[PDB]
Amino acid sequence: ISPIETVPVKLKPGMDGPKVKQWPLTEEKIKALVEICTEMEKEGKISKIGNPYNTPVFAIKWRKLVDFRELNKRTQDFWEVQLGIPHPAGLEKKKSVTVLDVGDAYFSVPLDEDFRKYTAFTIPSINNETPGIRYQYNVLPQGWKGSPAIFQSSMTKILEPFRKQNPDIVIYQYMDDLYVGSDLEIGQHRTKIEELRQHLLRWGLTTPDKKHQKEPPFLWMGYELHPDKWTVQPIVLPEKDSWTVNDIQKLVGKLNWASQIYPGIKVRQLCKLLRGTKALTEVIPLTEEAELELAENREILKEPVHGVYYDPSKDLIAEIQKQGQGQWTYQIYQEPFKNLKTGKYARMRGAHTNDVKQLTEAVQKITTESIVIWGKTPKFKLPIQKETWETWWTEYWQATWIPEWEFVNTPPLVKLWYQLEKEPIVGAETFYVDGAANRETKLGKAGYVTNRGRQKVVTLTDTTNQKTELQAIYLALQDSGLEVNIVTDSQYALGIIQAQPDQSESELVNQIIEQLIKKEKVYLAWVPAHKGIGGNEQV
Amino acid sequence: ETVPVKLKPGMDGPKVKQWPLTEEKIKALVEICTEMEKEGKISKIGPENPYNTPVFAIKKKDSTKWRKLVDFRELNKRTQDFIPHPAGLEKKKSVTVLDVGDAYFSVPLDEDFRKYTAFTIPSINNETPGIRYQYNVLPQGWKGSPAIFQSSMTKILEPFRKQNPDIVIYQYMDDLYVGSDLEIGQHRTKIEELRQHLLRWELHPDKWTVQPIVLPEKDSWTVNDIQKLVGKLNWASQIYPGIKVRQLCKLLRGTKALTEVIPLTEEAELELAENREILKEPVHGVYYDPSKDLIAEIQKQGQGQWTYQIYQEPFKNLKTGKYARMRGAHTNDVKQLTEAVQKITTESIVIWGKTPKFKLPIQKETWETWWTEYWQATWIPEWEFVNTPPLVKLWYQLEK
Ligand SMILES: CC[C@H]1C(=O)Nc2ccc(F)cc2N1C(=O)OC(C)C
Numbered sequence A: 001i002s003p004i005e006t007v008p009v010k011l012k013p014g015m016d017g018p019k020v021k022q023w024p025l026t027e028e029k030i031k032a033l034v035e036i037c038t039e040m041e042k043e044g045k046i047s048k049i050g051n052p053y054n055t056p057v058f059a060i061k062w063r064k065l066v067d068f069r070e071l072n073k074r075t076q077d078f079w080e081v082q083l084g085i086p087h088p089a090g091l092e093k094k095k096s097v098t099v100l101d102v103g104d105a106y107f108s109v110p111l112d113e114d115f116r117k118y119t120a121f122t123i124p125s126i127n128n129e130t131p132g133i134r135y136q137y138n139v140l141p142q143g144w145k146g147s148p149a150i151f152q153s154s155m156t157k158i159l160e161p162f163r164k165q166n167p168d169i170v171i172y173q174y175m176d177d178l179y180v181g182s183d184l185e186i187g188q189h190r191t192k193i194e195e196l197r198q199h200l201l202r203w204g205l206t207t208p209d210k211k212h213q214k215e216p217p218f219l220w221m222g223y224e225l226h227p228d229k230w231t232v233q234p235i236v237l238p239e240k241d242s243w244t245v246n247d248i249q250k251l252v253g254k255l256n257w258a259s260q261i262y263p264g265i266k267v268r269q270l271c272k273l274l275r276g277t278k279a280l281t282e283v284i285p286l287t288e289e290a291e292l293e294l295a296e297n298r299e300i301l302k303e304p305v306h307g308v309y310y311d312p313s314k315d316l317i318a319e320i321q322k323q324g325q326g327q328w329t330y331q332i333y334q335e336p337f338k339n340l341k342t343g344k345y346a347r348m349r350g351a352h353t354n355d356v357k358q359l360t361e362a363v364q365k366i367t368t369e370s371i372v373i374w375g376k377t378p379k380f381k382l383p384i385q386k387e388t389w390e391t392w393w394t395e396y397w398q399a400t401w402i403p404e405w406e407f408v409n410t411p412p413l414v415k416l417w418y419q420l421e422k423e424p425i426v427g428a429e430t431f432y433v434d435g436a437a438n439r440e441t442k443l444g445k446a447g448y449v450t451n452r453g454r455q456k457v458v459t460l461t462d463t464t465n466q467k468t469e470l471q472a473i474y475l476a477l478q479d480s481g482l483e484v485n486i487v488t489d490s491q492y493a494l495g496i497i498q499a500q501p502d503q504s505e506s507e508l509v510n511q512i513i514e515q516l517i518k519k520e521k522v523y524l525a526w527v528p529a530h531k532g533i534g535g536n537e538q539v
Numbered sequence B: 001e002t003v004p005v006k007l008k009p010g011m012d013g014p015k016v017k018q019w020p021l022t023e024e025k026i027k028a029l030v031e032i033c034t035e036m037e038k039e040g041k042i043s044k045i046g047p048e049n050p051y052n053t054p055v056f057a058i059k060k061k062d063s064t065k066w067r068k069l070v071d072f073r074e075l076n077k078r079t080q081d082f083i084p085h086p087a088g089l090e091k092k093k094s095v096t097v098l099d100v101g102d103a104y105f106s107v108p109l110d111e112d113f114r115k116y117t118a119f120t121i122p123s124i125n126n127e128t129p130g131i132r133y134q135y136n137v138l139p140q141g142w143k144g145s146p147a148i149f150q151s152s153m154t155k156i157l158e159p160f161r162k163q164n165p166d167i168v169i170y171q172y173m174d175d176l177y178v179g180s181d182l183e184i185g186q187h188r189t190k191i192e193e194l195r196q197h198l199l200r201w202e203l204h205p206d207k208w209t210v211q212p213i214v215l216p217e218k219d220s221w222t223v224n225d226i227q228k229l230v231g232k233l234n235w236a237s238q239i240y241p242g243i244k245v246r247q248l249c250k251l252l253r254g255t256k257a258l259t260e261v262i263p264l265t266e267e268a269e270l271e272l273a274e275n276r277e278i279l280k281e282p283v284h285g286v287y288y289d290p291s292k293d294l295i296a297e298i299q300k301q302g303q304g305q306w307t308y309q310i311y312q313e314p315f316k317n318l319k320t321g322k323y324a325r326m327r328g329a330h331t332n333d334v335k336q337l338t339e340a341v342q343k344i345t346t347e348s349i350v351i352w353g354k355t356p357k358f359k360l361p362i363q364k365e366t367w368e369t370w371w372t373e374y375w376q377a378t379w380i381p382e383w384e385f386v387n388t389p390p391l392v393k394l395w396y397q398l399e400k
Helices: A027-043 A069-074 A103-108 A113-119 A146-165 A186-201 A245-261 A268-272 A288-300 A355-373 A386-395 A465-478 A491-496 A507-518 B023-038 B073-078 B102-106 B144-148 B150-161 B184-199 B223-236 B246-251 B266-278 B333-352 B364-373 B390-396
Strands: A046-048 A057-059 A064-066 A096-099 A121-123 A133-137 A169-174 A177-182 A218-220 A223-225 A230-232 A317-324 A327-335 A338-345 A379-382 A405-407 A429-437 A444-450 A455-460 A483-488 A521-526 B042-044 B055-058 B067-070 B095-099 B119-121 B131-135 B167-172 B175-180 B295-302 B305-313 B316-324 B357-360 B382-385
Touching: A027 A046, A027 A057, A027 A064, A027 A121, A027 A133, A057 A121, A069 A113, A096 A186, A103 A146, A113 A133, A146 A169, A146 A186, A177 A186, A245 A268, A245 A288, A245 A338, A268 A288, A317 A355, A327 A355, A338 A355, A355 A379, A355 A386, A355 B364, A429 A465, A444 A465, A455 A465, A465 A483, A465 A491, A465 A507, A491 A521, A491 B390, A521 B223, B023 B042, B023 B055, B023 B067, B023 B119, B023 B131, B055 B119, B095 B184, B144 B150, B150 B167, B150 B184, B175 B184, B175 B333, B223 B246, B223 B390, B246 B266, B295 B333, B295 B390, B305 B333, B305 B390, B316 B333, B333 B357, B333 B364, B364 B382
Parallel strands: A317 A379, A379 A405, A429 A483, A483 A521, B295 B357, B357 B382
Antiparallel strands: A046 A133, A057 A064, A096 A177, A121 A133, A169 A177, A218 A223, A223 A230, A317 A327, A327 A338, A429 A444, A444 A455, B042 B131, B055 B067, B095 B175, B119 B131, B167 B175, B295 B305, B305 B316
16 A cells, blocks of 8 residues: 555553543534545545544544544553754754655554554544444554654665765754755755655655745754854843743743853842742742843843854864852863853752862763764863872772863862871871760760860750761861861761862851861871770760 | 573563763774674664663774674573583683683574664764664673573583593683683693684683781881771771770870870780781681672772772671772773773682672762773673772771
8 A cells, every 4th residue: 555564563461452432522523523534534544444442532624633642551662762862063064954844744654554453533423322433543643652653763764775875965854854964066955855855755755845845044952053053042031020930930941041052141149039939920029139130141142152063073172160169161162262062060069079079070971961962072171280180089089080181271270179188297286076966855065175285165956966076076177276186086077078078068067178278287087986095085 | 493582570671771972983883783784693673672772882902893792781680590610710720711702693592582682873963863773693791692502512612621621611601711720831822722623613810819908017106006007906896806906095095196106005015916916817707608699899099009809798708809000091090990890800700600799989970981981891790889988998908
């Protein structure tokens, strides 16, 4: 009947065909369907039949709608159609690029005859009684689990030839589209498209004539695409006198998206407006800052952000910036100031980490991205001195790495905010710290005793097991000279501190970190708790 | 002719995602994959096949050509079950491994099982739908292959076995392990002899054990010195209950400057002495249990140094060791770790005939995006990522 071989489809093991009841429909909705199903019948898409299985048909001139939700639930799993699709930055410049809407192609593919029975549905009647008009599908049902999958594949095999015959011609199938591009001359190109078209058609595949086919630049996940370059679709920021929560959330969503392409976008103040909101429809007045912030953003969004495609014959370079603690920005280009890509990474907030570490992560994300965008790794231009890197890494407890990179002195630089002494400090006071707190009450004390006789203690209410110890340590730091030694039985220090964090979730920690950073020299030492170990036995 | 291989009861086929690959690697897999398809070893597949297994490309020990590698770990696990370990293999003066992966292609894979062997070749930037294939012959890496081929493997091996007995032959997956006490030249020359034989169709186990811990020795000791010494021993007492810190901890009373020197009491003196002696040997009563999983933990010591232990029960080591990075891996933590894991696994196979489960001191992301870049072995152990406890490190840092 049709060119293409069908693909063998099965119902999930054990399950069986749909058994849904056909809704009752108005006399005018029924007529509309009766007429559509006749045409479809004619065209050969559906077959008259009248089969245990049934699926509900609808009516939205009228346009019909069949609900396969049940069928689907019972349909075997397939090899999923990648939701990961091309990102402009990883595309090539083409002298030309066409698009072939094969919309009607869906219904142009044969359905495993062995499986059609399942698609059986029924046109109702005014007469709740009379025998409904029974049909079933011969081609891929609009809205059926397998459809997407199959169709692409089919398409794929049909191009296998043509592609092979035209190594200098790129074809991209997405949804019910075909982005065919190349570097041939307009006539050569035109001629080839027309060649592609008739080949598809040789398979019962229909495309629109040259006086229908869509035009450049093309819309792609946020960008307008010209065959020589891309520009970001300019984004429109509403202007209202009344802003609801919903409103602010959408906005923020939008703004955030922009941060990648556009530099300087902020939402801190806009985000504030969502505090303690009682309802989506709740109206929140914009504060001054929020009115301002929002303003500078409208200014930034005017600016046209134009970009450059991927030239496979040139270096791939990524440069990074620390826009704040835990905030990083990057741009990937091949030619100074002509980026194929940019982006920023949200202030990842951990339990305890450091900037060098964070930098390393950014680098890995970036890497994984490109491996995809370009199937290649960029040469890194990083705001950190090789000395810094070698100091930190060579000794960090955890396996880490950064691909080929070079130093780039563009403040603010990423550094080691402090380095615990490798050995105890001679002449520096020695604080023997300890903290204890009633497990259950959250009442405790924390203090130290030094070799110089200095002592102290504080009682703390509403505190935990760990918090005291740390506070112990905190105190010691406050009360010591630019050089100190601190002994503790805390397991938590041994790590969290000895692994030298310059940022944390724990505010306390944060404070200790501030303190640590301030000193000239700090040596921390750990000893087993509950031991005859002096100092520890004072505590 | 084929044996009806099946999945463990109620188990379904693997559906693992393909990780992104360097353009280069992709180009190779395609070249490779077309070859195999030509030779009918594999066949492109339909979308009605939802399973998948990751695949990738390597350039193992010394070559200008890429080798296709497939991660059947999941499949393996779901594959039904079906020669014991040569207790002496471990006891030979020298071992050599062999890649007999090829032998497998010479065999058809059960018709109804192939679907599960499905794999996908990517395309940079998803510019092309992946290239789907499924095996027709026994694939390299699947646990089923060495087995269903055991029959013809032994068959072709006997004549060489029976021809020498002073040599041991052990097969693990795609690999073959053989050891002899013969000197270097003879050993090798004999190996080639074996290859030749097979063609027709550097380990020295005697250094592996649990390792010796040595405590510091000093002219004079400081409070700190002693505190550290004490923390170590104290911990160590979870392995040796004879280890004692009583005397030492007494010297630690009062609140002296970390840097003040302390004179050692004769008691403390003997204590140290007594502990040194306890540590002169691995803890007693440690015996490999075949029914349990083998665990292999690793620590980053730094300066390219790496310690590791292989145990089944906590503080009961079957073996411990150090590994020092190879040449030209300097700036590469990942490469070294990768190198070591391979080494530790080979040594695990050699000894008990199976791979351990690793605990890695590296972030999942870091490991995942780069381990394949330095892998060379046909097999692939299991692994999890962890945070190294500071003491475990300091302790094993003390090995002789
Ligand atoms: C077919 C050529 C291919 C490509 O290499 N560069 C461009 C450049 C501009 C475009 F408008 C499209 C495309 N191409 C493509 O497949 O883009 C899809 C995401 C639409």
